[PDB]
């Protein structure tokens, strides 16, 4: 040391760190980027649970984001911002278990409520270093301590031969847990309060949060949780041990590998790209909103299905914020349902709707499919292309997010949790996806993190004010278990979601409007009737 | 003698009677025999034409009511008694009634023929709500109504037997239609313009005449109020008819010939006493002896026939009342009564769905319950009550009607559809029942025009509108007044726009889709489901 900035030097369990002073619109923040929290899970450690990072010597430079965990990269629309913004923005490597910290500058004087972000990406993709996950705005404007970690995705994170020692499954979730332990031991050195840790995540990140809620060793590592557009329950976030075994075995065959020990040993000799290049090929049916390698119900991390666990758990101690965007499903249609594209209006035919339902509900028998079609058909205009288009999107949206969220909120509420629910209805003026996609999956995130406060990003003034409201809701919830501003009454209030009143709020440019019932009739179909229908055919 | 009251028909001379309607006199000829009394060995048999008679047959009085069960659930109560027989019971009951204006029309006049309902187990053409004088006086109509055999006497069947072939109550109707062709011209009626109209089982009967070729040369237009030949209650298979007839026989102590012979020795009331005991399930809106798919009067099931028929020649007016189901709940479903608000629990609601949909599997009944529950208030007694009613009305009338309208329109027919939403100010059933099954009829027949019935002025004005639509439909096949040039008008029901009108105190309103989402469930999904279970 000596001639550097004394307000950026910090020590953690593993050694000394040097961070960097970043500019946010309203003033400086402290960033500590690319802190290793585990031994690199490379070589003989592929598919293995992470081990704690061994201490380093000297001052580790923590001024740049580290490698992105090895993953599939999206090529559907080359150079198109709407997809590229989700793509990896650092080198791909199996050596990727690093986390990031943003704090006020100078670091706070008294212990400060901590937010931990867990990114989504269907458990096959994602990075804590993407622009839309920039912690500088929350840190500066709200004083937050924000932590985001990389966790293994795809095969490296979730390939499992359940019961084996060399590929037990869920190691990507264990990566997340280790970072949560890391925060408990170390965040006080940044001025963070380890006794006030709130998780939040979107999509698969949201399901991840749900799984930490349902896994008792994680429960002592956080106090509050936010789930954006994702649930541990539902049709995509988990797979049985049997199906995980089948998928892992198939992928092995596809890449040359013929006793679990031998199979896995062969898999470890494969280049990481050979695994990625065959990842999408092990799905049992033509599907959208399905992902090959995801958490497995192993009887360990998850002692039973999420459905069983949320049905029979005590949650009096728990405060959760859950919600959805207006058009959860539209995004997914163009990655598989014939007739859909980002470059036209995607008006489809009844025939294409019927084919789309089979793809969006890949597990449905012919009867169950017909039930879906009859429910979502408008029988005053059963062949109107526009209606069939938006119905296809609603089928995928409802089945995958909105009704799993509706069930989660309902079960948690019935079992003592304090639940707050929202629907996010504002479409970013900057959005590059077509209008027909409305407010797609993932496009509330940039507002929660407060990107519109960045003048160079060309958001409107109203969007700027909006983002600020949202940042207050999330941070007030992190601080108190309550999104409402205590020092405020004039602004409309956000009631808890109950089973009796089923209240939730609209989040848009207008002030909070309280609504009752979260697709109540339609989710009764998905959550109550469909399972019995499938079970009888 | 008044020459206006003397008519000669092919069977001999009739004398009728002059009756007062609020705006003037009408000629009525009541109690005209159109068949040989279907008594003794002629029980369960096809009717035969009435033999000629000497002198002048007195036709100034309603004849006897076909032998039937009499309702006793609420003894003395106007709301039920108004449907009970108002003349003596007799198997000797095959007679019809004719109202015409006074004096007899000088031009041949459109004929309306009323077929009563009563679940094929009851009914009579002599009920006060079927009084034809108002239509005859105000609209100058010639109106005809016949008694037809009901219950075991009209529909007990041993398919394929000669002595109980089934459907004879429908042949009773057909013979009266033939009679009208042969004789109505003597009353001033136009045999070349005959419109059937009927309600509930009557509507269904009308529907079956549409689907039976020998009936088609006897009428030109049809009105089906709150009833269809398709659906769950209007017909039974040959096998199920055989089963019920055999069970009834067993129950009263009885080779087909020998079975039916013993049945013919049984006093009438002995059959009625066990009539309601041959149903396969604990049911409501389900009747023991109804038309049978004999492969003769009905060459195939009504759904097969309306699915394949050519109805380009046809004009039809069809409709429903607001609360088709309410009436029936108090006749079986625990929790329901006319004497309290019938607020039920969720348990009772599930229990009542099994009774309202007797043929549903566990899964199918769960589907009904899940579809009709308001999940914003899944346990609210008022919603559950009103939903129980809706299940029964939608399953049995509204969706069957919507299917018929749809298939007829798609296959060339000219269709007009309504929903009747005015509740009679004189109604004696409780408010929660709303506008029950049957309570449009008194308005169509023009009863409010009678000062002594204490209807309101607006209800009088409304009855005159309804009589206008119905008679205009009879004259032209189009219920719209060809002189009233003010919008809106009653548009044709089509498969595309699915337009129908509301009938109430306010001017016609045009709506689209007759419970389309809900009827898609009943008409399209449920049958896949019962089948798959
Ligand atoms: C190997 C592979 C490759 C593509 C898929 C696949 O389903 N692609 C469709 C696009 C999904 C959307 C991703 N996304 C975009 C923005 C914000 C969040 C998210 C994810 N939220 O969870 C699936 C696989 N696979 O699992 O085999
Ligand atoms: C032997 C018997 C006795 C009673 C029933 C039965 O279902 N009773 C319930 C009441 C039905 C409503 C009758 N009704 C009332 C006013 C206006 C029209 C109508 C009928 N429209 O069609 C059924 C049987 N049975 O069939 O065996
Ligand atoms: C939109 O484009 C896709 C791919 O180019 C195509 O499959 C689809 O038919 C198109 N739809 C319309 C309505 O142009
Ligand atoms: C904002 O608008 C300016 C106008 O010149 C443009 O140059 C810039 O690229 C825009 N930024 C974004 C993020 O769209
Ligand atoms: C209404 O009355 C009937 C019989 O009198 C009874 O069985 C039923 O429980 C009552 N309903 C209510 C809601 O009290
Ligand atoms: C009409 O009301 C009067 C009482 O004002 C009553 O005397 C008469 O009997 C009523 N008529 C009918 C048919 O109810
Ligand atoms: Cl005689």
From Swiss-Prot, chain A:
It catalyses: acetylcholine + H2O = choline + acetate + H(+). Predominates in most expressing tissues except erythrocytes where a glycophospholipid-attached form of ACHE predominates. Glycans are attached at residues 259, 344, 458. GO terms for biological process: acetylcholine catabolic process; acetylcholine receptor signaling pathway; cell adhesion; osteoblast development; positive regulation of cold-induced thermogenesis; receptor internalization; regulation of receptor recycling; retina development in camera-type eye. It is found in: Synapse; Secreted; Cell membrane. The active site is at residues 203, 328, 441. The keyword Lipoprotein applies. One of its GO terms (molecular function) is identical protein binding. It is an enzyme of class 3 (hydrolase). Disulfide bonds join 69-96, 257-266, 403-523. It comes from the Eukaryota. PROSITE patterns: CARBOXYLESTERASE_B_1, CARBOXYLESTERASE_B_2. InterPro entries: AB_hydrolase_fold (IPR029058), AChE-related_enzymes (IPR050654), AChE_tetra (IPR014788), CarbesteraseB (IPR002018), Carboxylesterase_B_AS (IPR019826), Carboxylesterase_B_CS (IPR019819), Cholinesterase (IPR000997). The keyword tRNA processing does not apply. One of its GO terms (cellular component) is Golgi apparatus. Pfam families: AChE_tetra, COesterase. Synapses usually contain asymmetric molecules of cholinesterase, with a collagen-like part disulfide-bonded to the catalytic part. A different, globular type of cholinesterase occurs on the outer surfaces of cell membranes, including those of erythrocytes. Terminates signal transduction at the neuromuscular junction by rapid hydrolysis of the acetylcholine released into the synaptic cleft. Belongs to the type-B carboxylesterase/lipase family. This is Acetylcholinesterase.
Curated annotation (Swiss-Prot), chain B:
It is found in: Synapse; Secreted; Cell membrane. Its EC number is 3.1.1.7. The active site is at 200 (acyl-ester intermediate), 324 (charge relay system), 437 (charge relay system). GO terms for cellular component: basement membrane; cell surface; extracellular space; Golgi apparatus; neuromuscular junction; perinuclear region of cytoplasm; plasma membrane; side of membrane. It is an enzyme of class 3 (hydrolase). Glycans are attached at residues 255, 340, 454. The keyword Transport does not apply. It catalyses: acetylcholine + H2O = choline + acetate + H(+). One of its GO terms (molecular function) is collagen binding. Gene3D superfamilies: alpha/beta hydrolase. Keywords: Cell membrane, Disulfide bond, Glycoprotein, GPI-anchor, Hydrolase, Lipoprotein, Membrane, Neurotransmitter degradation, Secreted, Serine esterase, Signal, Synapse. Disulfide bonds join 66-93, 254-262, 399-519. PANTHER family: ACETYLCHOLINESTERASE. Belongs to the type-B carboxylesterase/lipase family. Terminates signal transduction at the neuromuscular junction by rapid hydrolysis of the acetylcholine released into the synaptic cleft. Isoform H generates GPI-anchored dimers; disulfide linked. Isoform T generates multiple structures, ranging from monomers and dimers to collagen-tailed and hydrophobic-tailed forms, in which catalytic tetramers are associated with anchoring proteins that attach them to the basal lamina or to cell membranes. In the collagen-tailed forms, isoform T subunits are associated with a specific collagen, COLQ, which triggers the formation of isoform T tetramers, from monomers and dimers. Interacts with PRIMA1. This is Acetylcholinesterase. It comes from Mus musculus (Mouse).
């Amino acid at each position: 040391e000596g001639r550097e900035d004394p307000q950026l030097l910090v020590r953690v369990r593993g050694g000394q760190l040097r961070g960097i002073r970043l500019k946010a619109p309203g003033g400086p923040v402290s960033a500590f980027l690319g802190i290793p929290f585990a031994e690199p899970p490379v070589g003989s450690r592929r598919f293995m649970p992470p081990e704690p990072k061994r201490p380093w010597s000297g001052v580790l430079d923590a001024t740049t984001f580290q490698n992105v965990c090895y993953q599939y990269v999206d090529t559907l629309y080359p150079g198109f911002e709407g997809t590229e913004m989700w793509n990896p923005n650092r080198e791909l490597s199996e050596d990727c278990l690093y986390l990031n910290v943003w704090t006020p500058y100078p670091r706070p004087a008294s212990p400060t409520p901590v937010l931990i972000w867990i990114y989504g990406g269907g458990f096959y993709s994602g990075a804590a270093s993407l622009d839309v996950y920039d912690g500088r705005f929350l840190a500066q404007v709200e004083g937050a301590v924000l932590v985001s970690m990389n966790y293994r995705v795809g095969t490296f994170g979730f390939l499992a031969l359940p019961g084996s020692r060399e590929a037990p499954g869920n190691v990507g979730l264990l990566d997340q847990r280790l970072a949560l332990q890391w925060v408990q031991e170390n965040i006080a050195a940044f001025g963070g309060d380890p006794m006030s840790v709130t998780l939040f995540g979107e999509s698969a990140g949201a399901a991840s949060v749900g799984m930490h809620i349902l896994s008792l060793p994680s429960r002592s590592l956080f106090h509050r949780a936010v789930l954006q557009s994702g649930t541990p329950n539902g049709p995509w976030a988990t797979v049985s041990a049997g199906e995980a075994r089948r998928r892992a075995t198939l992928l092995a065959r596809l890449v040359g590998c013929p006793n679990d020990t031998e199979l896995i040993a062969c898999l470890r000799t494969r280049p990481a790209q050979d695994l990625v290049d065959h990842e999408w090929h092990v799905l049992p049916q033509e599907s959208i909103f399905r992902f090959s390698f995801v958490p497995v119900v192993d009887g360990d991390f998850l002692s039973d299905t999420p459905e069983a666990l949320i049905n029979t758990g005590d949650f009096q101690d728990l405060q959760v914020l859950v919600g959805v965007v207006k058009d959860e499903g539209s995004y997914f249609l163009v990655y598989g349902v014939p007739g859909f594209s980002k470059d036209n209006e995607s008006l489809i035919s009844r025939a294409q709707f019927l084919a789309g339902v089979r793809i969006g509900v890949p597990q449905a028998s012919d009867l169950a499919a017909e039930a879906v079609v009859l429910h979502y058909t408008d029988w005053l205009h059963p062949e109107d292309p526009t209606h069939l288009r938006d119905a296809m999107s609603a089928v995928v949206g409802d089945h995958n997010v909105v009704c799993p969220v509706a069930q989660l909120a309902g079960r948690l509420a019935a079992q003592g949790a304090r639940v707050y629910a929202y629907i996010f209805e504002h479409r970013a003026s900057t959005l590059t996806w077509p209008l027909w996609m409305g407010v797609p999956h993932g496009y509330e995130i940039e507002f929660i993190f407060g990107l519109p406060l960045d003048p160079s990003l060309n958001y409107t003034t109203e969007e700027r004010i909006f983002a600020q409201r949202l940042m207050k809701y999330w941070t007030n919830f992190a601080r108190t278990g309550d999104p409402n501003d205590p020092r405020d009454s004039k602004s409309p209030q956000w009631p808890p979601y109950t089973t009796a009143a089923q209240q939730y709020v609209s989040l848009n440019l207008k002030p909070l409007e309280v609504r009752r019932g979260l697709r109540a009739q339609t989710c009764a179909f998905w959550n109550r009737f469909l399972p019995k229908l499938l079970s009888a055919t």
